[PDB]
Amino acid sequence: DIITVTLDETTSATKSANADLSKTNEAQMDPLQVGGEELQIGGKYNFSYDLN
Amino acid sequence: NSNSFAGDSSAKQSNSISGYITVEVIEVLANGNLVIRGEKWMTLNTGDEYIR
CB atoms within 10 A of CB A41: 9
- Degrees, nearest 5: CA angle B45-B50-B52: 165
- A vs B: CB pairs below 8 A: 8
Rg (CA), chain A: 35
β-bridge pairing A37-38 and B40-43: unpaired
For residue A43, which amino acid is it? G
Q: Which CA distances in Å does B21 have to A15, A16, A30, B42?
A: 17, 19, 58, 12
The most distant pair of C-alpha atoms in chain B lies apart, rounded to whole Å, by 74
CB B22 within 8 A of CB B40: yes
State the Cα–Cα distance between residues B50 and A18, nearest whole angstrom.
16
A25 by DSSP, 3-state: which? coil
Resolution (angstroms) equals 3.0
Q: How far is B44 from chain A (nearest CA, A)?
A: 6
Q: Which residues of B touch A13 (CB under 8 A)?
A: 44-45
Label each residue of A1-29 as H, E or C.
CCCCCCCCCCCCCCCCCCCCCCCCCCEEE
CB atoms within 10 A of CB A39: 13
For residue B32, which amino acid is it? G
A48, A51, B4, B7 alpha-carbon torsion, rounded to 10° = -140
- DSSP state at residue B32: S
B37 by DSSP, 3-state: which? strand
Q: How far is A21 from chain B (nearest CA, A)?
A: 14
